[PDB]
C-alpha cells in the first residue's frame, strides 16, 4: 500500500514539474517481479490503484490492469543493479534537449551536483528496439550511475528508492534547463571543482533531504490554498 | 455528425492546452460525409472555447449547410487540400509558438529525437510566402506544396497538418509543435543537430503513427483537458 | 462602455503575460477636450474593474470617478495632441518586447502576425532616464511620428490606436512578434524580412476593424474563464 | 505583522517563479542575536504566518513551533555586518541562477534593472555556516544584492518588502539579460548617472510598498470580470 501511494505521488510530481511527452513515461519499483503504472495512463492521472505488480513475462500478479510492455526492459536494469529499487524514464523537455544535441551534463551549479560523476551518456540510438536489446544496452551504458542521458531519446534515473529516482529526475530536468539556457546566452560552461562537487553531491543525496523534498513536492501536487483575505 | 463534432471540440481543447494560440489564426476542419462540404469551427471563436455546437457544416461557397453560425472565410482553402488528398479527412492550421519559429527562420525540421519521427519524411516546407492570397490561390499553393505529406511548415507563416482522422491531425499538430520546440531550444544552445538514421527514423515514425497509439494518446489528452483531481489529502 | 472596454483591455494585457510591477499605463482620449480616462494609481492591469478608470485633466485633477491618476501617464496628453487619430495608448515593459528594447533591436518583419507593425513601429534610441511629462511627451510624440507603435530603447514599448481595441491588439501582436524574433535569432541568427508589398497587404488585412474587434472580444472572453468540456 | 509580511513575501517569491527546499528568508528580530525564519521542510508556496519561528545564534527556537533550516544560520553574519539590513532572501531562482552558473555579472541595460545598478555584488568563488557567513558578508559589502557563482543569489533589504522587491526585480533583470544575450550577444549598458537616478526613483518606499502590496493581492486570487 505504501509503495503504490509513493508511486502515485512520484507520478504526480513528475507531471507537475513538467515532464510529459504523450504516453512515453515509465515508472517501476522492484517488488523477479516489479510494480508499474498500468498501460494507457499518464503520470498526471495515476492513483494508487493504477499500480500493478508483474512478473518477467508481464503477467499481472497483483492489481487490475495490463503492464506497459515498454517497461519490460526495466528487469535487465534491476538484474544488473541490486542496489536499484526504482526506475523512471521520460522524454522531459529540457533533459531531452541535451539528449537530442548529444550533450552531456556539465556540473556548474550546486543543484546539478547530485548528477556529478553520476550521469552516464548512451551515444547510440537503436530506434524502437525490442525489450531485451534495450535492457542490455541501457544496463551496460548505465554502469554504476544514478542516471543516464539516452541520445536522441530522453533519460532514465535509477534510485535506491522511488523517492530517490524522483528526486534525480527533477534535479536532472532542472540541471538540463539551467545548462541549455546558460549555453544559449554564454557558450560552454566552466565546471565547478570535482572535490567540492562530490561533497555537494553527497550532501544533497542524504536521505533526510531526498525524503523531505519528495514530501514537499507531494504536498504541492495536492493544491495549496492562497492566504486568506 | 454528433461524434464528429465532439471529436473536433476535444481536438480544439487539446490544441489550446498544448499552447498554440495566435489570436483567431487557428483553423480546423473535417471532411463531411456529404461531397463538397466540410465541418469547421465557426467564425470568431478560439480553440479553447470550442464546444460541439460550435462546429458547422459548410459548402464550397461558405454557405452554412448545418448548424448555427458563419464559417471563418480563411478556411475555404481547405477544400483544395481535400480535393487533392482523398486520404485526408481532417486539417489543422495554426501559427503555434515554436513551429512558427521554424517557419519564420525558414528552417526545416531536422529529425534528431524519437518523438520528432512522426514527421520524418512527412513534413513538406513551403519556402515562398505569398502574402494574403484569395482562398483559391492559397488552396492551390498549399495543396501542391504539401504533396503526399502529413504536414507542412509554411515559411513566414505557421504550419498545417493533414490527417486521415481528426485524432491523427491533432496528434501530428502536437508532435510537430513539440519537435519544433526541442529543435529551437537545442540549436540556440548547441547549433545544428545531427539527424538520426533514416531507416530507424522511418520505423519509429510507423510505430508512433499506429492508430492504436494515435487514438489512445488523443483520448489521454482529451481527459487532461477536462481536469484531473489531485491525490486526496489525509 | 469606455470603462468596461478599458477593464477588459487591462485583463487581456495581464493574461497575455505583459506584467512588470506597477509599470503599466493605459489611457483613452475623453470626449471632453483636454481630458483622458486612465487606470487609477496603485492597481495592476490584472485587478482593473470599470470603476477603477477615472477621467483626469492636464493637471492630473480627477474630473470623474473615484481615485487619483498615475502621474506617469501625464505625457499621454502630448501624444493625443500630436495625433488626432489616436484615441487609446498603452505602455508596458512586457517581457519579450523589452528584450528588443534592451538590446536596441528593431523589429524585423519576417512572419504573417508581425505585419500589423510593418512600417508601423518607430524606435526611440535614446533613453532619457526618468523625465518629467513635459520632456517625455515631446520626445515620445516626435519619435512616434505617424506610427501605431514605438519600441523605447532600454525601457519598453508604447502602442497608439484609433480605439482601445486597436491599442490592445497592437500590444499583444507586438509582444508576440518580439517573442518570435528573439527565439528565432537565438537559434538561427538574423532573419530574412518578407517582401514589403506583401507585408503591407497582410498589415492592412490584419488591421481591419472586424478582425481587430473579433480578436479583442475573443481575448475578453478568455479572461473570464472557459469551462472544460464535460 | 512580521509573520504576516513574511508569509506574503514567501507567496510572492513562489508566484513570481523562484522554487528549487533551497529557499531561505529571514527578518531581524527585535530581540538581539535572533531572527525570524521559515521553518525547515516547507516551501515558500505553502508558508503561513504560523510557519515563521524566531531562532537564536545556536538555531534554538525561541518563539513558534518548528525547527530552523540550519542553512539560514549564516544570515546572522550578514545582520551583524549590516545594521541597515532587516530582511534577507536567498533562493536558486531559475534566471538569476543562469547568471550565477555562467559567472556573468548583471549588465544594467533597462529601466527595471536599475534597482541593482551599483547595488549587486558578485562572489566568484564557490566554496561548496561560519565560513559561509564571513565569505558572503565580506563579498556583499554595502550592496543590496549578490550573485553567488555556481549557486544562486541573495538580497538584503531594509525591510522584508524591500528584500522581496529586490528579489523579484533581480530575477526579472537576469531573465531579460539572458534572453537578450542569447539572441543578440553582449548588451550596451545605460548611462550611469541616469541609471543611478532611476535606481533611486524605483527604490522609493512608496513604490516598494505599493508594489509589494500589489503582488500580495495577486497571490490571494483576483476574480475575473
Ligand atoms: Ni522512451
Ligand atoms: Ni495562417
Ligand atoms: Ni515605463
Ligand atoms: Ni543556496
Residue numbers in the entry:
A (entry chain B): 28 to 58, 62 to 259
B (entry chain C): 27 to 260
C (entry chain D): 29 to 258
D (entry chain A): 29 to 48, 50 to 157, 161 to 257
Sentences from the study reporting this entry:
The enzyme responsible for the core function of heterotrophic nitrification is pyruvic oxime dioxygenase (POD). POD is a non-heme, Fe(II)-dependent enzyme that catalyzes the dioxygenation of pyruvic oxime to produce pyruvate and nitrite. Bacteria of the genera Alcaligenes and Pseudomonas are known to perform heterotrophic nitrification, which produces nitrite from ammonia using pyruvate oxime (PO) as an intermediate metabolite. PODs have additional sequences at the N-terminus consisting of 20–30 amino acid residues that are not present in class II aldolases, corresponding to the disordered region of AfPOD in its crystal structure.
Since an AfPODdN18 variant lacking the N-terminal 18 amino acid residues showed no POD activity, the N-terminal region should play an important role in the POD activity. The crystal structures of AfPOD and AfPODdN18 were determined at resolutions of 1.76 and 1.55 Å, respectively. The structure of AfPODdN18 crystallized in the coexistence of manganese was determined as a tetramer containing 918 amino acid residues, 682 water molecules, and 4 metal ions. The N-terminal regions (Met19-Arg28) and C-terminal regions (Lys259-Arg261) of each subunit showed no apparent electron densities. The overall structure of AfPODdN18 is nearly identical to the AfPOD with a Cα root mean square deviation (RMSD) of 0.3 Å (845 Cα atoms). The anomalous difference Fourier maps suggested that the electron density near the His triad in the AfPODdN18 is not a manganese ion. Nickel or cobalt ions may have been bound to the His triad, rather than manganese, during overexpression or purification. The dN18 variant of AfPOD completely lost its enzymatic activity, indicating that the POD-specific N-terminal extension of about 30 amino acid residues, which is not present in other class II aldolases, is essential for catalytic activity.
